[PDB]
Design a protein around this ligand. Structure first.
Ligand SMILES: Nc1ncnc2c1ncn2[C@@H]1O[C@H](COP(=O)(O)OP(=O)(O)O)[C@@H](O)[C@H]1O
Ligand SMILES: Nc1ncnc2c1ncn2[C@@H]1O[C@H](COP(=O)(O)OP(=O)(O)O)[C@@H](O)[C@H]1O
Ligand SMILES: [Mg+2]
Lengths: 41, 577, 463, 193, 315, 159, 193
């Protein structure tokens, strides 16, 4: 029971971290789309 | 009152232009109707309004005006017997005006601007007032409501009104700088109403339930937290510690919940009975109410409105109890607010600042000498609900870091019909070490020692339930079946408590101490007796056991006379074997 | 007097931008006239002073920049509603799709709902029989309640949807005697269905006679996703109209809330913004609360809205955000199971994880019958300790149990195939209770520890 | 265009026992088969395309390897159609955009296959369409939305993915044609996670 | 003097003062509201055209018309004196007991420079706690830093207060000790509640333990930047005492969970990709610049010895 | 590396069991290598110079101190040579493509200098097409006698 | 540069009993010590510093406890190398960049260490370089990358991490120098995951 609950908390952690990287890269895409198509030229 | 127009709408985000000088986090009226939003992210000239209601229908071109003040609560007389929502609007008059719907664009005032209150002045024209000083009272509900200087303003005073019967828009004292002080005043909901000394926990918050003031005290000013599963008798303990409590103003904050889980409150919480008059309870109750589809910022700001209202009643000198219900709901309202401000989440989708906000809520709670020169407190019984029984969820973990007492409510005890359904295994209290001399000088002199005796006896029964499960209760040793039998009589007369029975409901410290000593005296003579001259069946079949079982059904006006008979009968009937 | 904004630039996928539109409100509906003349629909998001943005509903194929023009229609989305629409089918937007002529709308309503006032909401108090016995006895739907059906994938949630649709009635017999008239309606919002499930529904309704009191909002999967977002708004505003202005008791059945949330996730990604937990949008909780909290009895109004949303949990977890937030607003759940379905049991509800948080104030004396909550508790605990004895006997051997565990074994195995395995018959509430007491009477008296004395005296000893 | 959608009451006899007994599929039915790499998808769909009781069979290799299309070119014309006496290769149209052939054409491959199948449905035949690796078409959409700098949905796929998958799988289903005689397209889509 | 006006843009905790070419990077400003409510803030990212002030506290009541930015004291300095011993301060050195404030013997920077690795000598001697398993099985050599890894419900504050109020150095166990070696405890309590605060008040004023300790209570409803700065003020006072008056200062940093949560809160302003559990990438650096300031110095006689107490959040 | 060198040492085709006739053509080996260190390169070169294969093998060495982007050219170099020598001179070519994990990291580097939206764990969305355009340049041709047989190597990260 | 690189055939006598018996490492070899905290990992680096057969030892610590470096400065000039006599400090060059010293220099600290070890390689010694906490070096590459606003991969680290770290570990080996005399440099790298 504690070994499996430890592995479950480990897997929940790595999945949350990859989700956090995805919602970083979305901010970068939105920043680079707005910083061209809102103020270029 | 800087006014501009709209140049962009997108969802709830209204980029409005022509506003140079709107202070940030002011709230502002959008459109011709007035949709109340708040001002985020000033940029050059523009200002990005976040509208509370949905913006379906606004055109580019409608005027935005600024109210000029931040998120303001309106403190004054007339707030009691009120059912507000998360931004302090009265739901009763919105029902009276617009039928059954909270239509958008509704403008109503928090306090009745058309109700006369009977003024009674308590300064002389000539004196000098500073913030938080009383300047006259108002009879509200058998309740000397006071009227305070707002916490900044000071000066001398000419022109106090005489003992008239006014309305809340009337300037009653007029200071030497113009500066006309009305009965009411606003206050920003995210700032602590300043006091002069936060005191220290010396005095128990006498709840009435004889588990939650004997075994796990909460110590007026402190902080408790309860989880609520289904079936566990959540509402009956919340209503019983609003009803039979110690503190004389109750503020209830339902911070966004199921509609049929709060309409039972709104049809049952008014029709309770204050057991000091026999009248209703709502003459000492404010009730902030949110369902779920009310807009997100109302659900986010509701517990701040509740704690600021209860700080205002603290500033008059009244003990206040605040029951903030289902703070995990408030937490996910905050999570949605973090999602629309484009922030990077924490562990779960929560923001980084979650523990900061929960600390700001549970730390505006405490015994205090106010600016006037008198004490009060805002003791919080603030509840939590993990959606899975799943502590080390981030909200529950931050709550358990900053609370002072924590009270589990297993449904299994409610399933085994043991009410109040508190679990004495998972719960704990951190105020037992500070409430030691109050007990030693007011309840009885030896009180914590028999507290610790009963607590470790519960520890022993819960320990050796194991080979009770392997074998059975009837084939133990003879000094261990005694432990489980006294553990059973403790659970069936000192912890279990019918909240509807008129005399079993409220239980003071002298009565709880009497029951407590009586059980403990029975045990300390029975364990001496089982090794010399008796069996076990010549103990459990003994007619003082029914008198200990009846001992909680005794009026406190006639208890100690019964306690003397019961104690002497214990001494006699254990001499008799 | 139309006003075509031509002069559009930048079509991209779903989006198109119109140059000078300071007249369109945010959230308007628009006609996009092609070069040739086919009209599309669009919704205005993001109006600004230098352009306006239109999200086109359907495909963008014939569009160019020369000959393309948008035109306003109905600048906030309304539904034209009558009492007459009780034999009609509609497709998301609210246009008839059965060949009968358009209705004459005596009112027009905004499809986003105003929220109810909690001072003016009385509490749910009386029941509504569904015929399905494992619902009507162990977790009763009451009026003014929202309780979902946690399907799986392969489970026949659509068939139990249609069965509750054509079988539910109130019953004014067993209340305090209450004017039998009490008209009734089923609003049925199927969002994101196949063609096969659609032909199933429009044959399953037409064969009985139960299309003359229902109304069906059906859209297929290859219909525009933004129509699928508009669909539960349409259904709930028809239902809320009917029940609080013509005193109907309305039951609303929202099929496939998973498909709603997926369409919501894809439109939230089209809106050029950033999701939240597990990729679903941030405001998902509020957007589900908006369409579940439009149900309930009201103080003074005779009508009542009851709401069964039927949703498939994605990969069989209640910790997905769709069943998480749905069970975190709604009251209880009933839960289908693949195990009873593979043994072949219809409808495959198992009542162990099922719950109605509001049965206890809906059943009992005068509402349905005296013994109801006690019978339900005894059934639950007896089947619940029948199940583990079944699991135990696969290693113990049937000999080495007592008599009493053996009786619980026979109870469990005759329970799940006389009380649950209903078939497609209609069990009114007293037939359900007489099967309940016939099932409990395979146990001795006094083993029935929860039921009080009189009911064991009166109803025991059957079958 | 079509005159009428029927409802399906005739199975699609695959030949494989578990498919045509335990989890059957009717004649106008979509059916999806996911699996890991090296799990037996392509062999399953070759046996489906080799033994089913359909009249004609359109095999869409949408982003899959070439030796397992040259298999179909070389060892089909030795076989024999089970319903009639023609060789097996006289009943399959074979659309094949392999892996290293260019990446935009995968969308075209899925649509060309489904519209050929709709033509032979309109004639009156009963067409089976084995299209494999729709997720390679989803990948093609992901790469061109990378070039477009649109914002992605979860995992990187563009948001109109499920809209196009529904717009493809709803094109099956046992119709009464415009001509007045019935026919059917059944779709078996292989999904590779 | 020289109030920069002309704020272009205020968004979150950030504001963009334009025409600020005279501000240094990393300087400290105070932002003056139109009502007169000043706030702290730090210049980050000074461009050729604007500077990104970070407001530490909330940006509430700020506006663009009537907001000023001053420039106060380019490096965050502190006024220390040896009459601090016996007095309780804030997180940032405001006195909180009503005793009158400190006249600074010296004003010195609160970051602290890195010690030179050839100047540090080895931790040698022994200091005595009262705990038997801290004295015998483990052993707290003075000069080192060693943490107490408590848990969720464990007593950490009780053991903090115990080995604060009773730990002594005994030179008589060795020789030559100059038997009254000057000893002091700097107790930096960060992110604590009011109950724990009142507990530590009474626990230090019972015996004479306050008369040789400095106290840095934080009372966790303050702005988060005070929770950041509390270990730096504690270690600045401890480094002063130990390296200018030859003490043997023992610093107890009470809750290093709350310091790192405050760090995660406030360092989200610069919008980087974060590390493992949401915490920043640089958190090894920022934990290191307050753990490495312990240690003895060859040529002096004074020492700093740290006990950082932290709760494993799950165990 | 030892199993790949062992295969390329002794892989023969059996005509005793097929009826082709002996005529035995052994294998040309196109040995491509991407970020080998020295410790594996010395193993393969000692192995080939022992077993007499450096007279039939063309070696494309990209050591791990050479700059990390010409790995994008190296498999295409080796497969262009292999396609030539197989399909226009009737060889029976065996291509050893060492450690494609280094190649795949060599184009994760380029595809994240361009902010190209990735698949899972950072690798770009188009990487399947690049691995496809490498791997699918193998196989036999109808009408010719050439062949290209590929043994790529992978070093699975957390295996 | 080197003339050519011999392959290693000669052990690097680490002076322990597990790491020269069970898991030996040759003279021109590369080895890694990954370990979580409180599992030594520094006592083993120091026992490698003292008890080796290297002729010189370049001990580079980058981002590491300062007490380590002052232990090495205080207790090394009173030891004896068991090869020549004389203080054991007379053969070690140690490049310290303590954890609170600035974070951009612990990128270059590794390179300065490996260049000085290569210089004593070209004089024909058997150098042992010991990098301590290459993971703190990789953290420095992260903090100079996110400052430069790049798009990271796999927990913040820039995607050229293996390019840099591979070209670091590649500089080891046993060569014959351009003077013709042979010499080698081994490399032991501590990893703190
Ligand atoms: N019905 C079957 N009979 C015999 N072999 C099979 C069958 N199904 C799968 N296989 C084997 O499984 C392997 C998987 O082939 P394939 O379908 O190409 O995998 P994938 O699932 O990756 O497409 C094949 O090599 C084949 O030998
Ligand atoms: N300056 C740049 N340097 C490197 N890569 C870029 C740069 N600008 C864009 N890219 C990448 O190349 C793609 C360019 O697409 P886009 O410019 O929209 O059309 P096109 O395909 O015609 O270049 C984008 O997806 C982006 O990831
Ligand atoms: Mg395949």
């Amino acid at each position: 029971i504690p070994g499996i609950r430890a592995q479950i908390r480990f897997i929940q952690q790595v999945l949350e971290q990859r989700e956090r990287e995805d919602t970083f890269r979305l901010k970068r895409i939105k920043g680079k789309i707005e910083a061209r198509e809102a103020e270029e030229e | 009152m800087i006014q501009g127009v709209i140049q962009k709408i997108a969802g709830p985000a209204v980029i409005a232009k022509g506003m140079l000088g709107a202070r940030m986090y002011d709230i502002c009226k959008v459109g011709e109707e007035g949709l109340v939003g708040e001002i985020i992210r000033l940029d050059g000239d523009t200002a990005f309004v976040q509208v509370y209601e949905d913006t379906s229908g606004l055109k580019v071109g409608e005027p935005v005006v600024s109210t000029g003040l931040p998120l303001a609560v309106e403190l004054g007389p007339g707030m009691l017997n009120g059912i507000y929502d998360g931004i302090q609007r009265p739901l009763e008059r919105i029902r009276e005006k617009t039928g059954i719907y909270i239509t958008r664009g509704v403008v109503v005032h928090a306090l009745d601007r058309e109700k006369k209150w009977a003024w009674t002045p308590m300064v002389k024209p000539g004196d000098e007032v500073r913030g938080g000083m009383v300047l006259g009272t108002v009879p509200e509900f058998g309740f000397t409501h006071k009227i305070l200087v707002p916490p900044d303003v000071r000066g001398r005073v000419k022109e106090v009104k005489p003992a008239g019967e006014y309305t809340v828009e009337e300037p009653v004292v007029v200071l030497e700088d113009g500066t006309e002080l009305k009965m009411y005043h606003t206050w920003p909901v995210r700032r602590a109403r300043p006091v002069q000394r936060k005191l220290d926990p010396n005095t128990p918050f006498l709840t009435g339930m004889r588990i939650l003031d004997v075994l796990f005290p909460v110590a007026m000013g402190g902080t408790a937290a309860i989880p609520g599963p289904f079936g566990s008798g959540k509402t009956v303990t919340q209503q019983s510690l609003a009803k039979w409590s110690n503190a004389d103003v109750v503020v209830y904050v339902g911070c966004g919940e199921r509609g049929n889980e709060m309409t039972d409150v709104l049809v049952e919480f008014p029709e309770l009975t204050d057991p000091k008059t026999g009248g209703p309870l709502m003459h000492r109750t404010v009730l902030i109410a949110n369902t779920s589809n009310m807009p997100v910022a109302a659900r986010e700001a509701s517990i701040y409105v509740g704690v600021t209202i209860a700080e205002y009643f603290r500033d008059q000198g009244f003990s206040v109890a605040l029951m903030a219900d289902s703070t995990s709901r408030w937490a996910e309202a905050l999570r949605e607010i973090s999602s629309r401000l484009e922030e990077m989440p924490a562990e779960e989708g929560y923001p980084p600042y979650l523990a900061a906000r929960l600390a700001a809520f549970y730390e505006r709670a405490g015994k205090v000498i106010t600016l006037g020169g008198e004490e009060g407190a805002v003791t919080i019984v603030g509840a939590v609900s993990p959606p899975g029984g799943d502590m080390s969820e981030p909200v529950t973990q931050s709550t358990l870091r900053i609370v002072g007492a924590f009270w589990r409510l297993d449904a299994s005890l409610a399933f085994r019909r043991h009410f109040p359904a508190i679990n004495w295994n998972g719960s704990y209290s951190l105020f037992t070490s500070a409430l030691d001399p109050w007990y030693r000088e007011n309840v009885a002199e030896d009180y914590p020692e028999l507290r610790d005796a009963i607590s470790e006896l519960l520890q022993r029964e819960a320990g050796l339930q194991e080979i009770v499960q392997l074998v059975g209760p009837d084939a133990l040793q003879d000094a261990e079946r005694l432990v489980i039998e006294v553990g059973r009589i403790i659970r069936e007369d000192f912890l279990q408590q019918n909240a509807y029975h008129e005399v079993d409901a409220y239980c003071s410290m002298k009565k709880a101490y009497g029951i407590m000593k009586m059980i403990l005296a029975f045990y300390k003579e029975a364990e001496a007796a089982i090794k010399r001259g008796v069996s076990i069946d010549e103990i459990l079949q003994l007619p003082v056991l029914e008198r200990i079982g009846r001992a909680r059904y005794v009026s406190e006006e006639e208890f100690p006379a019964y306690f003397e008979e019961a104690m002497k009968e214990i001494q006699g009937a254990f001499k008799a074997l | 007097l139309k006003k075509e904004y031509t002069g559009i630039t930048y079509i991209s996928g779903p989006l198109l931008f119109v140059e000078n539109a300071k007249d369109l409100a945010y959230g308007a509906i628009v006609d996009i006239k092609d070069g040739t003349g086919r009209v599309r629909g669009g919704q205005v998001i993001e109006v600004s002073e230098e352009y306006a943005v239109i999200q086109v509903f359907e495909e963008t194929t014939g569009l160019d920049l020369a000959t393309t023009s948008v035109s306003l229609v109905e600048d906030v989305a309304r539904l034209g509603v009558s009492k007459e629409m009780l034999g009609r089918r509609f497709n998301g937007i609210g246009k008839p799709i059965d060949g009968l002529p358009p209705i004459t709308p005596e009112k027009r309503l905004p499809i986003t709902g105003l929220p109810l006032n909690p001072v003016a909401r009385r509490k749910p108090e009386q029941f509504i029989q569904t015929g399905i016995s494992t619902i009507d006895v162990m977790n009763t739907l009451v009026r003014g309640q929202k309780l979902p059906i946690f399907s799986g994938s392969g489970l026949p949630a659509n068939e139990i949807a249609a069965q509750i649709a054509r079988q539910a009635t109130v019953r004014p017999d067993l209340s305090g005697e209450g004017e039998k008239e009490e008209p009734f309606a089923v609003v049925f919002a199927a969002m994101g269905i196949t063609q096969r499930e659609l032909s199933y529904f429009i044959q399953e309704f037409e064969r009985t006679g139960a299309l003359s009191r229902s109304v069906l909002f059906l859209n297929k999967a290859d219909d525009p996703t933004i129509e699928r977002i508009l669909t539960p708004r349409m259904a709930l505003t028809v239902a809320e109209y009917l029940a609080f202005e013509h005193d109907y008791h309305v039951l609303v059945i929202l099929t496939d809330m998973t498909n709603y949330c997926e369409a919501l996730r894809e439109i939230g990604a089209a809106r050029e913004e950033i999701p939240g937990r597990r990729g679903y949008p941030g405001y998902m909780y509020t957007d589900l609360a908006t369409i579940y909290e439009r149900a309930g009895v009201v103080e003074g109004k005779k009508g009542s809205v009851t709401q069964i949303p039927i949703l498939s949990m994605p990969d069989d977890d209640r910790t997905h955000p769709i069943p998480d937030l749905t069970g975190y607003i709604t009251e209880g759940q009933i839960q289908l199971s693949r195990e009873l379905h593979r043994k072949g049991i219809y409808p495959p509800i198992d009542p162990l994880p099922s719950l109605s948080r509001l049965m206890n104030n809906g059943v009992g004396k005068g509402k349905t019958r005296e013994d109801h909550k006690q019978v339900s508790d005894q059934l639950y605990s007896a089947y619940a300790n029948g199940v583990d004895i079944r699991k135990l006997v696969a290693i113990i051997g049937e000999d080495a149990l007592t008599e009493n565990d053996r009786r619980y074994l026979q109870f469990a195995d005759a329970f799940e195939r006389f009380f649950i395995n209903q078939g497609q018959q209609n069990r009114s509430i007293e037939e359900s209770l007489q099967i309940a007491w016939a099932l409990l009477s395979m146990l001795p008296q006094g083993e029935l520890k929860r039921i009080s004395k009189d009911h064991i005296g009166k109803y025991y000893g059957q079958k």
